[PDB]
C-alpha cells in the first residue's frame, strides 16, 4: 500500500498507470474480438477471445466490437475481460495490493455505476476505490480552479461550468456526438468519392486516416470554393495493400459536423452553441471568469485550427466588448489521467476512498451520495 | 415531344418503355458478348460484338461479361453499346424526339453520375433527362407516401426510410449482397453435390435453375431435419443436353444466405437486421408508421415464403405489442419502371428536367444538386 492505480475507461481507448507518474504505462484501444472463421489447423487451440493490441494486429479475421458505446457499457463480459487483461497481463499488479480509481462521463445512469462498483468490490476485491468525473480531473491537470471544460471524447462530448471552490450541476450539457459519428460520416463520404469501407478493419483504417489527414476550416464556403480549384489541397494516403487514396474536401468536411450536426440529421446544436447556452445559464458575474478561461480536453479536439474557429465563433456570438481566450495545451489527450493521478496523490483524498467494510454494511447506493 | 422514355439500368435485366404504358416494351438482360474462337467460314463477317437476346441464344461460343457490377459501371464502352442497341434496334426512337429518364442505386459515386450525364448529353444529344432513385419510384408505383423500401436487386440491396412528404437520407443502408453472390454460392454448393459449372453459359443455366426451383424456409433446422428424410423434397430439372439434375437442400440453402451472410464470409448482417437498424435510427414517432408499411421490390424477393419469414423475424425482434404488416405486390419486378413512368406523366415534373442549355452553361456538377 504505497500508491494507487488510475484507470480511465475511455469510450474508444483505455488509459492506465501508477499514481505519481507523468505518463501512462498502458495505452491500448478497447477492442474485444472473437474469431469469425471456423479454423482448420490442429497445432493451435489459441485464445477463443482476443483483446488489446493483439486484436488490432490480427483484426482481419475477427469481428471487432467496442464494449462501450457512447459512454454507456453494453456488454459487461467484455468490460470485465478488458479489466482483467489490463490488470494482469499489462500492469502485472494484483488488485489487492493497491486501490483503483475510475472515471465516467456526467449524466450517466446509476445502474452502470452500481454494477461497476459491485463487480470491482466482489470480483477483484479491491481494498478501496472511487468514482470521479473526467472534467474535474482535467481542471486538476490544468492547475486551475475556474473555467469551462470541453471534454469531447470518442463517445461523448460534455461541458461542466465551474467556479472557485464549487460547481454548477444545473448547467451541464451532454452531447452524444463524438468521434464514432465522425468516422461513420467519413465512411459515408468516402463512399461518395469512390472508395468503399464497411467492415470494422476498414473502420480502424478510416479512423487512422482521419487521425492523420483531417483538419478544421476557418470558413466553410471559402474552403469549398478553393476546393473548386482543386490543385493544392488534395493529399494521398498509402493503404496497407499499397493502394493510394486521394482525399480532398473530405479533410475539412467531416470535422465541420461538430459545428453543423444537421449533416448527420441530429436536431441539436454545435459545440459553440451548447457552450454559449451553458455559460448563459450561469450567473452574470461568473460569466466573465468563464469567458476568460476555457479548458478543452479529449481526443476529438486535436484538429489544428479548432481553437481558432471556436474563438472566432464565440467572439462573434458573445458581445464584442471583452476578451475571449482559448487555452489549448499540447497534452490534452492524457489530461484526465494526469488529473486523476494528481488527485490520488493529494493527502486530503486518502480518506475519501470507499472501503469494503463500509460498502458491505451500507450497500451499492453509497457511491451515489459520494460526490454525486 | 409528346412522351418520354424511362430506362432502368439494372445491373441485370434492363427495362425500357414509353411513359404512360403499364408494361415495358423491352426486357432483355445486360449482356455484351464477344467471340472467343477464331472463325473459319468465309460467308460471314458478322457483328464482332453481340448484345441482348442474341447473346443469350448463342452464349455457347461467347465470353459473356456483365457491364455493370454491383450497381457501379465498370466498362463504359459496353454500356454505350447497350444504350445504342436499346434506343435504335428495339425502341427504334431517336434520342432527340423524346427525353430520357435514368435511375440508379443510392450511395453511388458521383463520377458515375457525371460521366453518364456527360455521355447522354454529348453523344445522343437528348433534349433533356433526369436522374432518380429506384426506391422512390417504387413508392410512386405502390401509391403510398410512407414506408420502408426493400430494393433487393440483382446487384445491390438497399433501404431508404421515408415519411409523408420527406425522406431520411441519414438512415440509408446499402448492402453489396445480391443475386450474383447467391448464384455463385449456388454454383459452389452444386459442386459439393456432384455437378460442376464454371463458365458463363452454365452461370446463366444456374441462374434459370434458381429462378425456377428455389424457395425460402421458415425454419432452417426443421427443413434440414426433413431433408435428412429426403423422400419428398428432392426435385428434378432438365438440362439443355437432356441430363437430369436432382436438387434437394440447395433449394432452401442459397436463399438463407440473405439472412445469414456469414455463409459467404461477409462480416455483415441480414436484411432483417439492417432494416431493424435503419428503422431504429429513425425518430420514435415515425417508427409506428414505418412498421405499419413495408414496401419491397426487386427481382431477388420473389421467392415464395420470403414475406412470411421477414414478418416473423421482424415481429420476433420488434416488441410484441403492435402489428407488423408485409405488403408483397405480385408485380414488384417492374415497380421501378411503373413509378418512373408515373413520375414522368406528372404535370409538375415537366419543369424539373435538365436541358442542354443549362447543362452546358453550368456544367456536369448540376445533377449533383438536383435532388441529391
Amino acid at each position: 500500500e504505497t500508491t494507487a492505480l488510475v484507470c480511465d475507461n475511455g469510450s474508444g481507448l483505455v488509459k492506465a498507470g501508477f499514481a505519481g507518474d507523468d505518463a501512462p504505462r498502458a495505452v491500448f484501444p478497447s477492442i474485444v474480438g472473437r474469431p469469425r472463421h471456423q479454423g482448420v489447423m490442429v497445432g493451435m487451440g489459441q485464445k477463443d477471445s482476443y483483446v488489446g493490441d493483439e486484436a488490432q494486429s490480427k483484426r482481419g479475421i475477427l469481428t471487432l466490437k467496442y464494449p462501450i458505446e457512447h459512454g454507456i457499457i453494453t456488454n459487461w463480459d467484455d468490460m470485465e475481460k478488458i479489466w482483467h487483461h489490463t490488470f494482469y497481463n499489462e500492469l502485472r499488479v494484483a488488485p489487492e495490493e493497491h486501490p483503483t480509481l475510475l472515471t465516467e462521463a456526467p449524466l450517466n445512469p446509476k445502474a452502470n455505476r452500481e454494477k461497476m462498483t459491485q463487480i470491482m468490490f466482489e470480483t477483484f476485491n479491491v481494498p478501496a476505490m472511487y468514482v470521479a468525473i473526467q472534467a474535474v480531473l482535467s481542471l486538476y491537470a490544468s492547475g486551475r480552479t475556474t473555467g469551462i471544460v470541453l471534454d469531447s471524447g470518442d463517445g461523448v462530448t460534455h461541458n461542466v461550468p465551474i467556479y472557485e471552490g464549487y460547481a454548477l450541476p444545473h448547467a451541464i450539457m451532454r452531447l452524444d456526438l463524438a468521434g464514432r459519428d465522425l468516422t461513420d460520416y467519413l465512411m459515408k463520404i468516402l463512399t461518395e468519392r469512390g472508395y468503399s469501407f464497411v467492415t470494422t478493419a476498414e473502420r480502424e483504417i478510416v479512423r487512422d486516416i482521419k487521425e492523420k489527414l483531417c483538419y478544421v476550416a476557418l470558413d466553410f464556403e471559402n474552403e469549398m470554393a478553393t476546393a473548386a480549384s482543386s490543385s493544392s489541397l488534395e493529399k494521398s494516403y498509402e493503404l496497407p495493400d499499397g493502394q493510394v487514396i486521394t482525399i480532398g474536401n473530405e479533410r475539412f468536411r467531416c470535422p465541420e459536423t461538430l459545428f453543423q450536426p444537421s449533416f448527420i440529421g441530429m436536431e441539436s446544436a454545435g459545440i459553440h452553441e451548447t457552450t454559449y447556452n451553458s455559460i448563459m445559464k450561469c450567473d452574470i458575474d461568473i460569466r466573465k471568469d468563464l469567458y476568460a478561461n476555457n479548458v478543452m480536453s479529449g481526443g476529438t479536439t486535436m484538429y489544428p485550427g479548432i481553437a481558432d474557429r471556436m474563438q472566432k465563433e464565440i467572439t462573434a456570438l458573445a458581445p464584442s466588448t471583452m476578451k475571449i481566450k482559448i487555452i489549448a495545451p499540447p497534452e490534452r489527450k492524457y489530461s484526465v489521467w494526469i488529473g486523476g493521478s494528481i488527485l490520488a496523490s493529494l493527502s486530503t483524498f486518502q480518506q475519501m476512498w470507499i472501503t469494503k467494510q463500509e460498502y458491505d454494511e451500507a450497500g451499492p447506493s453509497i457511491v451515489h451520495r459520494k460526490c454525486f | 415531344e409528346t412522351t418520354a422514355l424511362v430506362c432502368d439500368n439494372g445491373s441485370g435485366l434492363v427495362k425500357a418503355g414509353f411513359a404512360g404504358d403499364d408494361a415495358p416494351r423491352a426486357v432483355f438482360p445486360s449482356i455484351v458478348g464477344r467471340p472467343r474462337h477464331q472463325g473459319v467460314m468465309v460467308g460471314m463477317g458478322q457483328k464482332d460484338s453481340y448484345v441482348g437476346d442474341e447473346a443469350q441464344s448463342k452464349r455457347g461460343i461467347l465470353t459473356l461479361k456483365y457491364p455493370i457490377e454491383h450497381g457501379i459501371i465498370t466498362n463504359w464502352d459496353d454500356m454505350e453499346k447497350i444504350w445504342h442497341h436499346t434506343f435504335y434496334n428495339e425502341l427504334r426512337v431517336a434520342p432527340e424526339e423524346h427525353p430520357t429518364l435514368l435511375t440508379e442505386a443510392p450511395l453511388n459515386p458521383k463520377a458515375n453520375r457525371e460521366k453518364m450525364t456527360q455521355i447522354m448529353f454529348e453523344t445522343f444529344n437528348v433534349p433533356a433527362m433526369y436522374v432518380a432513385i429506384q426506391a422512390v419510384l417504387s413508392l410512386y408505383a405502390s401509391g403510398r407516401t410512407t414506408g420502408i423500401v426493400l430494393d433487393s436487386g440483382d446487384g445491390v440491396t438497399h433501404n431508404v426510410p421515408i415519411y409523408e412528404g420527406y425522406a431520411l437520407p441519414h438512415a440509408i443502408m446499402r448492402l453489396d449482397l445480391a443475386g450474383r453472390d447467391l448464384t455463385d454460392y449456388l454454383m459452389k454448393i452444386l459442386t459439393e453435390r456432384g455437378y460442376s459449372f464454371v463458365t458463363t453459359a452454365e452461370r446463366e443455366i444456374v441462374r434459370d435453375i434458381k429462378e425456377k426451383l428455389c424457395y425460402v424456409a421458415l425454419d432452417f433446422e426443421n427443413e434440414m431435419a426433413t431433408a435428412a428424410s429426403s423422400s419428398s423434397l428432392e426435385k428434378s430439372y432438365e438440362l439443355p443436353d437432356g441430363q437430369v439434375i436432382t436438387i434437394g437442400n440447395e433449394r432452401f440453402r442459397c436463399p438463407e444466405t440473405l439472412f445469414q451472410p456469414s455463409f459467404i464470409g461477409m462480416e455483415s448482417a441480414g436484411i432483417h437486421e439492417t432494416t431493424y437498424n435503419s428503422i431504429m435510427k429513425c425518430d420514435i414517432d415515425i417508427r409506428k408508421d414505418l412498421y405499419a408499411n413495408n414496401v419491397m421490390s426487386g427481382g431477388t424477393t420473389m421467392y415464395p415464403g420470403i414475406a412470411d419469414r421477414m414478418q416473423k423475424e421482424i415481429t420476433a425482434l420488434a416488441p410484441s405489442t403492435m402489428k407488423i404488416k408485409i405488403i408483397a405486390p405480385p408485380e414488384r419486378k417492374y415497380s421501378v419502371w411503373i413509378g418512373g413512368s408515373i413520375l414522368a406523366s406528372l404535370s409538375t415534373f415537366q419543369q424539373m428536367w435538365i436541358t442542354k442549355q443549362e447543362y452546358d452553361e453550368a456544367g456536369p456538377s448540376i445533377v449533383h444538386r438536383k435532388c441529391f
Binding site: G194, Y195, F197, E202, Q243 | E69, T74
Partner: peptide
C-alpha cells in the same frame, strides 16, 4: 470499386 471490392 477502386478501393475495396472490384467494381
Amino acid at each position: 470499386w477502386x478501393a475495396x471490392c472490384p467494381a
